[PDB]
Structure formats: C-alpha cells, structure tokens
Ligand binder design. Sequence first.
Ligand SMILES: Cc1nc(N)nc2c1c(-c1ccc3oc(N)nc3c1)nn2C(C)C
Length: 910
Amino acid sequence: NREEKILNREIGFAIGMPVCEFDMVKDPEVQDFRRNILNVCKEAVDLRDLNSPHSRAMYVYPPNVESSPELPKHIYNKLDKGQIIVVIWVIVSPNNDKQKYTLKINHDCVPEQVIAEAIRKKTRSMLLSSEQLKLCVLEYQGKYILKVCGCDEYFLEKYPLSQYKYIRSCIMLGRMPNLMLMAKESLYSQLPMDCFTMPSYSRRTKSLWVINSALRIKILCATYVNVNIRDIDKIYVRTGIYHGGEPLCDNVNTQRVPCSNPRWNEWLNYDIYIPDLPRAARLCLSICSVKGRKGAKEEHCPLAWGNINLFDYTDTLVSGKMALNLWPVPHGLEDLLNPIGVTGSNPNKETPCLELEFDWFSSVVKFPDMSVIEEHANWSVSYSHAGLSNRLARDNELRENDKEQLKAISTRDPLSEITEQEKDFLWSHRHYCVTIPEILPKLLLSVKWNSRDEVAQMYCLVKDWPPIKPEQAMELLDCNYPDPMVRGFAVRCLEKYLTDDKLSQYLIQLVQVLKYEQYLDNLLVRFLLKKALTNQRIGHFFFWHLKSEMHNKTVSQRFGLLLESYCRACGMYLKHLNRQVEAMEKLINLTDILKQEKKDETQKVQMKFLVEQMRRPDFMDALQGFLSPLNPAHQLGNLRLEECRIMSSAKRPLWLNWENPDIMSELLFQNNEIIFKNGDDLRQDMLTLQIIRIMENIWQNQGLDLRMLPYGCLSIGDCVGLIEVVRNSHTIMQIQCNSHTLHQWLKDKNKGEIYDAAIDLFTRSCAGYCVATFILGIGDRHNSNIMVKDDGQLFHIDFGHFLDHKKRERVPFVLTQDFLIVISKGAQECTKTREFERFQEMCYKAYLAIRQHANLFINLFSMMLGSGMPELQSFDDIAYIRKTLALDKTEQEALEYFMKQMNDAHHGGW
Ligand SMILES: Cc1nc(N)nc2c1c(-c1ccc3oc(N)nc3c1)nn2C(C)C
C-alpha cells in the first residue's frame, strides 16, 4: 500500500525510469516476466533468512576468497615454514584505543582459530590465565569476527586464512595482514532485517510436427518510410529464416515497389518444411532501396532492419497479423540483413513499420514436448544402408585413428574453421563424442538445424551430455548457440561448477550474453538474478552493469524489468545504491556544465566554478557519505575539496578525494582517490583490464611472478565512469625532470639492500606488460601512458583500442634504452647481459602460457560481440589474437614468431 508506493519511488530512482511505465506495457511476456520472476526473489530471500543473523551477514559481507585453497609453490615459499605473521587489532573501551597483537600462525588456519590465538596473546599479558586454564570460556571465538583493517571486508566463513584474497595478496606482495577483532553482535545489530513484500502485480492446440506444409509469411505494407523521392527509385523487403547467425534456407525478396506507395501484399514462400523449424528459428528482414544505375551492377542499400522469433515465449508458433517497428542500419553492416541484430520491435514507434501476416492452421500451433522429441529421436535409430550417407556410422565403425582425429578436432580454437567433411565426420561419430565432452560446441555446429530428425537426436545427446568446465560452457552462451536446450545445458554447468569468485570475474560477459536470449524469462537470467540476490558483491556489479546500459533502447526493456525485480528483493542495499546513483548524477550534471558552458575558461576560473558548485548544500550532502561504486567495501566519507581538481587530460576528468571514515583507515589508506571521467566509452578499458587480470592469474598459478596492475574501472553509463587512482605512481614523462634518468630515479627511491627487489619488480612487471600488450594489440605506448610505482612496479594506463585498430601485427610497448638500462642494472651493453637473458625467458614463458589458454580469451571476446564496442563488431576482429598467438603454427614456431616481432620492433636483441 503506502510502503509499496514508497518502495516504487526508490526502485524508480535506482533504475532511472518509474515502475508505472512497466505497468502500462501491454505485452503479456513483459507482465508474465514481472510476475513469474518473483519466485527467484522468494527463493533468494528464504536463503538469506535460513540461518539468521549469520546468513544475512554472509549475503551482505560474502567472503572475498580465491577459487582453490591450494597455494602455488612460489607463494608458499614466501611463508616462514608454511606460517604467516598476522597483526590483530583490538579497539579497547575509552578514547577508542588501538592495541596490536602480532601472531605467527599456519597459513591454513580458520578465522575462529585465528581469533582464539589473538585472545590467548591478549590474556597472556595477565599471566593468571596463561598457566591455569587459558581457555577463558571456549575463548568465545563465537563472540568475535575478523574484519580487514581500513575496509568493510569480513572473514565470516570457515575458510583457510590463505584462501581469503586479502591474505594471499599480503603473502604475494610481502605485506603485513592487519585484521581487526570486532564483536559478532556489533556487526549483526548494524545489519537490518529485510522485509521482502510481494508487489501488487503478483496477484494478476495442435503440434508443429503434425503440419504437412512449407513455410509462408505475408508482407502487407510499410509506414514511416520517409526517403528522398529524388534519390530512391524503388524499394523492397528482403527476408530470411535464421537459427542464430546461420540461414536455414535461401533468402526471399518481395517484388520491387515505388517508395511513394510501399504496399506489397505478397505471400513469401520459403525452402523449409514447418515441422523442420528449430525451436530458436527467427524471421530476419529489412527494407532495402534499389537505385543506380549508370550502366553498372544494381545499387542495393538497406534502409532499416528487424528480426522476429518464429515461436513466442509460450512455445506457440507465431500466427496472425503482426507489425514490426524497424531499427536503423548500424555503420558498416555487410549483408542487406542483420541476423546478429536484436530480435524485437523498436520501442520508438515513429520509425519504419512493416506490417506482416503469418499462416493460420485452424488451431493454436505449439512446439512439441520432450516426450514427443525423445520418442522421435529413438524412432530415428544394414552395413550397405548406413554406407549410403556420410552422416551415418553404425556399430563397429570407430577405428583408433578416427578416435584420435576427433580428439585433435576438439583441441582446435573456437575461430578455427571446421570443414563440411569434418561436420559429417563429427555428426556420424556423435555417440563416441560423449567420451570427449569438451567437443560439444564443435558437434553442435555440425548439426543440420533445418532437420527435425537430426535436432531431435541432438536434443537427446545434450540431455545426457556429461558436464564441461564453466569456461568451456560459456562458449555455448554466445550468439552461435541459440538453442534453449544447448543454453540450458550451459547454465546447468555454471550452476554446478562456477564459483562466486569466477562468477564475479566473468560477470561482464554473462550480463552481455543475456542480450542473445530469445525470451525475457530464461535459465540464464534466473541463475544470474539468484546469484545477485544471494551475494551482494555480485549484486552490486550486476546492478551497475545493467544500469550502465539503460540509455540503450535495444536493451532498456529487458534490463529495466530485470533491475526492477533485483531492487524489489535486494533489501537494504537499494538505499545504498540510491546514494551512489544520486552521487553519480551530481557528478554527471557538474561535468556536463564544465564540458559545455565553461569549457573555454581558464583552469583557475574552472576550478573557482567547480569549488563553488561542490560547496552547494544539496551537492555536498549528495556527494559524501556513500559507498565507492568501484568497490562497495570502500566507504567514501567527507570530500577533501582541497585535493579535488579538474585534470589537464582531454574530456577534463575530475580527480576526486574522499576521507576513509574506517577507524583503522591509517593501516590501508586515509584518503580514497577516484577519477570521474565524462566523455569516453569505458567499456573497452574495462574488458582490457579484465583480460590483464586473467593473464596475471594464469601466470601466478603457473609459478611466474609477473606482477600486473589491473586497476579498477567501472562504466556507470553512456560514456561516464570511475577509474581507480593507483597510489604513489608517475608517468615516464613525469620522471624525466638522458637514458639513465629512469634508472637513476628508481635507484634514489630504492637505496641500499631494497634496490635488488625494485629492479626485479621492474623487470618482472615489464615482461608481463610486454607480452600482454603484444597479444591484445593495445594502442601504441609512449611516455605519458606508461607509469611506474615508487617500489619499481611498471604498468600502463589509457588503453583505448585493442586488437587491430589500424585496419601487420604491431608491438605496442617498444622498450627504449631507458627500460633496458634498469633491467641491466645500469649497464652499457644492456642487450648482452645475464639480466636481459633472464627477462627474455620471462617473456617467452609468459607468451606460451597465454597461448595454452587461447580458447578462453577467444570466448571472452566472443561473448562481448553483443556490446556495441566499435573495435569488436565481428569474429574477424577477434581473429587478430589468432595471429598474435600463432595458433595455426606449432609451439616452437610461435616462439620464433614472437622473437621475430620483438627483434623487428627493437631493431635487434631478440
Ligand atoms: C589510474 C591513474 N592512476 C594514477 N596514479 N595516475 C593517473 C591515472 C590516470 C588515468 C586516467 C584516466 C584513465 O582512463 C583509463 N582508461 N585509464 C586511465 C588512467 N591518469 N593518471 C595521471 C594522468 C594523473
């Protein structure tokens, strides 16, 4: 009632649009989605109330843990005989006095064991306890919890201490872990009880195979076709039947009609039997113009496009009259049709609108049940008869060479072309393929989707298909695999095998592939929503990744409806998110004024305006005392206006400084610095930094300590976003204040015995960025986009472009003598040294490690084709990493390729 109305206002503010706009949507799929999704909301809320208060605290403060407890060899060797030195702080009674207790404990210790040891050291001081029963009432390890000093990260779960990311990071970086002992009841009381209420809207036949008929679709007419009368001669509607990006039959065009009167009224006849239509079949169409001629080949041009699901959400074959409001042609679209394009009607109703009519079969036509499919597949099941088809291989037709051939095919990358000979081969040995589970994506592409006899057999294989790795399953969620049985199998693999660490890692791709789903209500969206509602760390970024795309009308309905369901069940976090949403609003509106109104004024004048506007009461209150959208464990306290400035960079980003209000802020960082950028699309940098993080993780698990710096980057909207400021770092140019300048700077910052570790860190970080940039084809490096930390850690900023931005494989990061001098510890002949030989070996080992994980990088890019990123619009863009990783070539041929690219770039040495 009254509390529902208030909540509706809060959800409305969070998503940008009012809840009422969803209520007025006539589409029954939209209303069914809103109602039916509420079961995910109910389920998630029940899990949070399962073991209160702990399970509610676990939702709010989930353990920031690694996927595997097992520690790499070089990380374990950093420990002192498998032990870690940990500092435990206790805030004692008046004036909030801090007391430290340094403990030496096993790296595999449980937080409760860690708490007991700390209370033993605290009670050791009163030697009364020590000798006789130090136990002190089971030490009430259940009365306390460990918090990370300086941020809102808790150790609420029984994991080994080393598995927590903060501790593993402390081990790797040789930093002292500072934890704070906090009373359980002090945290629990801070945590409010969530009151999930069901909204008011929660109250509101023949088989396809029994239709002995070919497909027909009627094109009636078009409206809002506003073309230049002088230019265009005639127009026509081009159509095609597709399963994903692949045609099921030849494309059918209407007759050419003058643009003045677009009225066709033609029944288009297709090369497909209605029972052979696969579940995910779609009509793809476009209004084209035909001009010219000058005595040349007829001048075709697409004006608008549109795609439609041939089956609706209820498995009903689309019948009757239907009008589709079309979309504008995206720049550089090849064919007259756009099958990769989003299925559905343009929300803008003042756009080309094609009126269609489908066939009618005197009954509601529905897609068959799994019982009908199984029976038909079983009913599809001599030597010479099986020999009549290359797509048939009977019992005792599997030699040892064909078994090894199938294995060889399964190792090939996703972008490798699987020939029609190989497709017949894979399909004929489909039952043996079960024994090599990873081959499924190759087998699926070998299926004739325009044949119900084959598809029905494939459905039964997918049903009883063994599980595959989450990373392998993710490929089955891209645009190439539209079938719900295939995608449902992939989601099942993620439900069973994907950790919340890995889910958080790949959340960007998982949010993206939602766009390829046929319907609003599906297994992927339910999986992701449940996770977002059972883990606030996932939910936070799930919210932002969906909100950052709300300005895109192609996905605003789907994402709006999904965000509504999230907000209705996320609990108290909505109130925190709304603070962030408002803070970002104020920053957008302020930067928009500076970018538009005051762009030509002097820095002093711009700063005067900034300071005045930031000191305004409504602004001040909105922009302080909220959680960092980059990491919501980071509290942003009061603004440090004196430290806040307009940056000299293009798009004139704001450098913002907030106080860290944590009691133990001093043991992490006293001030939180963030760059707010308005003008640039941050999606490409977000994806590169994700790939850098993945590459680093690969190397660290392989036992190659090449330290990367994937700093925080979050796109919050249409070319707006946040960038984590790397503390105590400078560009190469802002070091140069000769060739030895850089090395001399690091010598001064790292004097004495620390020098050797600083040079080592430089060489190791340099090697990682050299390999990473070459593979990814990052934008050309220079003195202003290469940075160095005081400790010697080298890293890059402002990526911009990846893959081929030229449009024959560049070396972005060319090592000048400055870098080689530091590597060779001040040598003259820096090339011929025992330090450079070590550095080269790091690069080779790093290069080959990524080459082994090529299928993952290809797949991560492939799932990102759905996003409108300009340098990632086709699989040919992705093919650049096939070149840099030399996948067609052998491992030794790949080393030679890498060495040759480095030799040509540096003009020798390699
Ligand atoms: C992240 C960072 N840390 C530090 N320490 N300094 C820094 C920076 C940055 C910066 C700014 C905007 C960026 O957009 C992308 N994609 N990467 C960026 C890096 N610039 N500077 C200089 C220019 C002040």
